[PDB]
Structure 1
Amino acid sequence: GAPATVTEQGEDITSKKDRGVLKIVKRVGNGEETPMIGDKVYVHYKGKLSNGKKFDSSHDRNEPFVFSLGKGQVIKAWDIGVATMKKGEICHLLCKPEYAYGSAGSLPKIPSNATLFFEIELLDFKG
């Protein structure tokens, strides 16, 4: 499925070139602008452990999820990954533990050393 395909074929979007954050575009967005560090960004998303059977369903898919890009308000993989998205884009994002919750995890739901998978839709952004 998409997690395996992203693992194998995804683009490495990290500065370190460690394949730690891997991306495949799902739905092509509009224009060429991407959000900038400090912009408010607004998304929809679904996430799971990368080997998980089903996406997590514990948030309201109506409501935009909002954060300030590049400020450490979300896991590192999201600060790197959302920065690459065009408005209206949907992408698949696979994130090794160093770009997610690392050795600590977030117990119980996120174990130690967990690789995560997301689908992210960028709705809008503003400076």
Structure 2
Amino acid sequence: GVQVETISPGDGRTFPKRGQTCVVHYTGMLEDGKKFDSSRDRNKPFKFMLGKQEVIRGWEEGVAQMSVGQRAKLTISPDYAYGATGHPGIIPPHATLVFDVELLKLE
């Protein structure tokens, strides 16, 4: 599933609701720890609507547990990410994914 390990705490009271747009900054890594993507390096937060299934299951469920302001490490097993298929061109089959995600704002 998805594990959430806090880096820096959020407000502990404002949690994303389905239908809201989560605004975040993230870095993604495979098990070797190497960065394969980063919104921070583009200096532009990434946005997604919780519940629209436009991000992997680990992200919908992991970010849903965070509060605004929280920065956490999300460790996602393959079944909650790309499974046996992977995402051709960047994530191989059977990949556990680790993301550093900071929930910046809700819109």
Q: Tell me which of 63, 86, 90 is aligned to 1:109.
A: 90
Residues paired across the two proteins, number: 106
Q: Tell me which of 33, 47, 54 is aligned to 2:34.
A: 54
Query: Is 1:98 equivalent to 2:79 in the alignment?
Result: yes
* Higher RCO structure (Cα 8 Å, ≥6 apart): 2
Which TM-score applies when normalising by structure 1?
0.77
Aligned letter for 2:92?
A: P
Distance 1:45 1:58, change over 3 A: closer
Mapped to 2, the partners of 1:58 and 1:26 lie a distance apart of: 17
- Supply the RMSD in Å over aligned alpha carbons: 1.4
Mapped to 1, the partners of 2:88 and 2:95 lie a distance apart of: 11
Q: Contact between 1:29 and 1:86, CA under 8 Å: does it hold in 2?
A: yes
Structure with higher Rg: it is 1
1:108 deviates by: 3.0
Bigger strand share: 2
Unmatched 5+ stretches in structure 2: none
1:60-116 CA-partner distances (Å, limit 9, x unpaired) = 441010010121000000000111111111000100111000111112321111110
4+ residue segments displaced more than 3 Å: 57-61
Which TM-score applies when normalising by structure 2?
0.91
1:1-55 CA-partner distances (Å, limit 9, x unpaired) = xxxxxxxxxxxxxxxxxxx211111101124110100101100000011x22422
Q: Contact between 1:70 and 1:80, CA under 8 Å: does it hold in 2?
A: no
